């Protein structure tokens, strides 16, 4: 039953009495549900510490992971080059899932194609798929370049990309001068950031390996910027702005910020902006190359050091105060350009905000999960704010990264509580936030269920989630936020302090019970 003036969607239409009776009848009659007391007992058991020892013990079962597979990162990297079509060699379900994932995160069109490999290719390989797909995509969507990745099916088959593409060009499917860079991106190795690294190295090697003879380091007086797997457009924008305000010539390599943010003006643009092939070709002429996310750019670092002869600086992600200062210092030293007064004023404003918000931030406990570089930058910023990161989780982190993060936590009195977990999923984190309750979580949308679980134990055990990372699905336009730089640091500070204040306001809102602390001024 609906009233035409007040139409109700599933919530709260299914809270009506007739629907409640229907659901009760269904459950009682045909579901054979466990007794509610048994369910409550099992839930309370899952809360406890003996459950956490069982949950930690598992060496095979993964529950609610916090990572994706390599071709997702490969597609994201390929999207950052001008008039380039990402091309995934394998089955079409991969491409459908990648496009849906990025569509839900960015709320923008995502263009990617596959060669739709089937049982025929499972038995006889996928060379004909490669030839037909290359010709079809070049004829239909007219790209200037096609970047080829692989799914797990291609890697198990052992189909090789180089021979397939060379045979495609030799047999007249595509012109011999058409650029077709490729990379092998097995989904059973690493994660999506590894796929980004592999694709970037493949493209860079495609454009800058057979002509090193006339390349002179520093001839164009520019600095190469390699962002890595980045899902915040504000980070690209802030890097560009900080380098432009400093009078520093730069080349942002694989920047997708234009195609991932296109105006709605009555026409659809499949391509927009991107790194030009000329910039890729001229990259070895640069003074140096800086990697914004070193911990998932390793093969790229090896290629740039051993082929372009660039002395890549040892820099951390420009997150927080100290690391942004170090990044600006290294850029100034390399380019010979002094830091202007605008950046100094911005840093002073960040320090002003830190001193203004310090009293609320001091001693807050945070549980956080994300990609290695992002997690370590967030931990560093939390330490600089006086906050306590008590649970640090990185599903795609290694032991060297864990050692570096532990060393970072050792140099501050706010990391005594902190412990670092690698290879653990979000079920482990649910156990951690149950047995050792923090004040807040910092992560992607998948943490919204953990909050839910905590709320089931009671309001005094609820751990609110703060949405920073990838992917964010239940909020709108948060992908336009900036995490990098002084601007990113102040945005993160505002989010953290206002989340704390909102939680306090919610807790102290009960009339004549807790509203004595419902202060107008905070």
């Amino acid at each position: 039953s609906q009233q035409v003036d007040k139409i109700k969607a599933s919530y709260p239409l299914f809270l009506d009495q007739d629907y409640k009776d229907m659901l009760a009848k269904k459950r009682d009659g045909f579901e054979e549900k466990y007794p509610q007391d048994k369910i409550d007992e099992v839930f309370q058991w899952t809360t406890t510490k003996e459950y956490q020892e069982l949950n930690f013990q598992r060496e095979a079962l993964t529950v609610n992971p916090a990572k994706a597979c390599q071709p997702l990162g490969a597609v994201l990297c390929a999207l950052g080059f001008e008039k380039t079509m990402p091309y995934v060699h394998g089955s079409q379900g991969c491409v459908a899932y990648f496009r849906s994932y990025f569509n839900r995160h960015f709320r923008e069109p995502v263009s990617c194609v596959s060669d739709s490999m089937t049982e025929d290719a499972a038995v006889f390989g996928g060379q004909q798929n490669m030839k037909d797909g290359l010709q079809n995509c070049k004829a239909t969507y007219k790209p200037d370049m096609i970047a080829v990745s692989t799914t797990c099916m291609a890697e198990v088959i052992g189909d090789d990309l180089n021979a397939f593409i060379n045979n495609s060009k030799k047999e007249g499917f595509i012109p011999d001068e058409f650029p077709v860079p490729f990379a092998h991106t097995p989904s059973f190795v690493g994660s999506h950031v590894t796929g980004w690294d592999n694709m970037f190295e493949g493209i860079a090697r495609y454009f800058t390996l057979k002509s090193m003879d006339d390349k002179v380091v520093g001839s164009n007086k520019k600095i190469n910027i390699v962002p890595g797997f980045e899902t915040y457009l504000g980070n690209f924008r802030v890097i560009k702005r900080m380098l432009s305000e400093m009078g520093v010539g730069y080349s942002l390599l694989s920047d997708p910020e234009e195609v991932l943010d296109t105006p709605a003006d009555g026409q659809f643009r499949m391509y927009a902006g991107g790194t030009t092939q000329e910039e890729m070709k001229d990259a070895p002429n640069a003074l140096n190359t800086v990697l914004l996310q070193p911990w998932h750019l390793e093969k790229t670092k090896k290629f740039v050091e051993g082929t372009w002869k660039h002395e890549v600086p040892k820099l951390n992600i420009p997150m927080g105060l100290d690391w942004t200062d170090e990044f600006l210092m290294k850029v100034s030293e390399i380019s010979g350009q002094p830091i202007p007064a605008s950046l100094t004023k911005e840093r002073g404003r960040l320090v002003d905000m830190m001193t203004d918000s310090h009293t609320w931030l001091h001693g807050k406990r945070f549980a956080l999960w994300g990609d290695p570089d992002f997690v370590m930058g967030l931990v560093k910023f939390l330490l600089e704010l006086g906050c306590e990161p008590v649970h640090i989780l990185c599903h795609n982190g290694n032991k060297r990264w864990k050692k570096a993060v532990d060393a970072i936590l050792a140099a501050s009195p706010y990391g005594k509580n902190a412990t670092v977990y690698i290879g653990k999923d979000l079920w482990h984190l649910r156990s951690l936030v149950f047995t050792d309750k923090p004040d807040f979580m910092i992560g992607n949308s998948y943490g919204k269920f953990i909050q839910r679980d905590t709320l089931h134990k009671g309001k005094e055990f609820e751990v609110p989630l703060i949405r920073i990372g990838f992917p964010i699905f239940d909020r709108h336009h948060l992908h336009r936020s900036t995490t990098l730089g002084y601007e990113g640091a102040m945005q993160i500070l505002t989010t953290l302090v206002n989340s704390i204040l909102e939680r306090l306001d919610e807790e102290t809102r009960g009339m004549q019970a807790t509203d004595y602390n419902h202060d107008l001024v905070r």
Partner: protein
């Protein structure tokens, strides 16, 4: 340290000022000598502020409304006059109360007459009567009305006393007028005096002839505790652990009933001398109730004050007092053992309007912290008489300090911490000096008692030591 250097510092600050301003401001700056016991011989106070010097004190309206009358929960307080004055003071000072706002509690509201041109040129007594009737019909559970005058009320020829008398005779309601016009006096102190006179003249004598209240030989009334962040409750838990019975607290979380029942108590414990000494003197003169001063800032002062209270009662009170001190010794001992090593030997400079700079010193010295300079915006001479003996030798004392003077003082002295009003909070944070909001406990607290000393130490530690105060300087300059 080095009195001659401190004297040279004062004179250098004085030189920029014009001759009259310099001559006036000379007498408000002093160097503390603990042997000296008469403040008027070295430092002067309670004088008119010098114009155009960016002063810090408020008006009489602030001292009456936002300080004394404001925290009374079941009264409805009307800011009589233009809108802005009552708007700037709404919920700006936090006095904790237990009640339902809108029904029986009205502390965090702004009732105002909202004067316009026609009210200025034709008066506002008729609007006052209509406002009283509207308050009566819309808020039926209010147990009394207060009318706090603003500047144009006194400046135009308005008579609110007659309106109050007529309306209180008609509705059988307590309606008190307060002539707390801002231009009266030089600071919030005259507001305190006017509010106390109003309480004496309209509220205190309501239950004089009524003797249906059972009396106990352990009856005390708290005067001058405004429950800032829950201070009064923290003191009251200790008092009731001593076995006493608190009939009233003035005026934080206070009610008209406790104010009326106050004359029936055996002792008056006055926490704020400056704001509420007048009412206690009147009570002693009329009802013969002795009053004494106590200090719950810090474990040392708390223990001394508790023993002092117990010394005015029987042996059971002293025994139960000794028991409370033994019960709470380990907690504050652990607090000290945790936070003293991180605050020992640090120097502070505090500027708070009255009572608190002398009071807070015991809590600081307990944490091994030295106050190298202290001042009061509105305190009288007697406050300074207490301060001199409460202060260390060769320290700086200031009265009605201006922004320039305070700025230069902290620049030359370089204290490790400053405790002051919000008007100075961001000024001294931009210099890299850690700052603590003494007036509002920085939205934290309470600070009194063994329960508040832990919060005080924790807040001091976190402000004094922070990973922000070391990052003011960009590392490329």
């Amino acid at each position: 340290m080095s009195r001659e250097e401190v004297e040279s510092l004062i004179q250098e600050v004085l030189e920029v000022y014009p001759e009259k301003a310099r001559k006036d401001r000379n007498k408000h700056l002093a160097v503390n000598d603990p042997a000296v016991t008469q403040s008027k011989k070295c430092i002067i106070s309670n004088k008119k502020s010098q114009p155009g010097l960016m002063t810090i004190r408020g008006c009489a309206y602030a001292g009456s409304k936002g300080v004394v009358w404001g925290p009374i929960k079941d009264m409805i307080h009307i800011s009589h006059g233009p809108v802005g004055c009552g708007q700037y003071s709404r919920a700006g000072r936090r006095n904790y109360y237990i009640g339902t706002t809108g029904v029986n509690a009205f502390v965090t509201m702004n009732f105002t007459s909202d004067f316009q041109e026609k009210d200025i040129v034709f008066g506002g007594d008729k609007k006052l009567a209509k406002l009283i009737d509207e308050v009566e019909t819309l808020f039926p559970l209010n147990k009394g009305i207060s009318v706090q005058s603003e500047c144009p009320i006194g400046l135009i020829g308005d008579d609110i006393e007659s309106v109050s008398k007529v309306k209180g005779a008609e509705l059988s309601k307590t309606i008190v007028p307060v002539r707390c016009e801002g231009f009266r006096g030089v600071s919030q102190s005259l507001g305190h005096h006017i509010a106390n006179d109003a309480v004496r003249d309209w509220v205190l004598g309501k239950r004089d002839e009524d003797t249906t209240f059972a009396s106990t030989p352990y009856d005390v009334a708290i005067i001058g505790d405004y429950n800032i962040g829950g201070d009064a409750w923290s003191s009251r838990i200790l008092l009731e652990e001593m076995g006493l019975r608190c009939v009233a607290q003035w005026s934080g979380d206070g009610s008209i009933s406790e104010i009326e029942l106050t004359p029936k108590v055996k002792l008056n414990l006055v926490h704020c001398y400056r704001s509420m000494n007048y009412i206690s003197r009147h009570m002693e003169e009329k009802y013969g109730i002795p009053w004494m001063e106590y200090n719950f800032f810090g474990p040392t002062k708390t223990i001394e004050s508790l023993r002092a209270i117990a010394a005015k009662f029987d042996e059971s009170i002293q025994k139960k007092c000794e028991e409370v001190i033994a019960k709470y010794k380990p907690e504050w001992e652990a607090v000290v053992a945790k936070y003293r090593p991180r605050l020992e030997g640090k120097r502070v400079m505090l500027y708070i309007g009255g009572l608190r700079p002398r009071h807070v010193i015991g809590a600081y010295e307990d944490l091994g912290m030295e106050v190298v300079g202290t001042g009061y915006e509105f305190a009288h001479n007697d406050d300074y008489d207490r301060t001199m003996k409460e202060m260390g030798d060769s320290t700086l004392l200031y009265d009605d300090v201006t922004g320039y003077e305070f700025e230069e003082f902290v620049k030359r002295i370089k204290p490790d911490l400053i405790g002051s009003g919000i008007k100075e909070k961001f000024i001294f944070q931009k210099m890299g000096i850690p700052f603590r909001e003494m007036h509002s406990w920085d939205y934290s607290g309470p600070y009194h008692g063994f329960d508040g000393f832990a919060i005080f130490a924790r807040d001091m530690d976190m402000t004094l030591n922070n990973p922000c105060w070391k990052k003011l300087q960009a590392p490329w300059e």
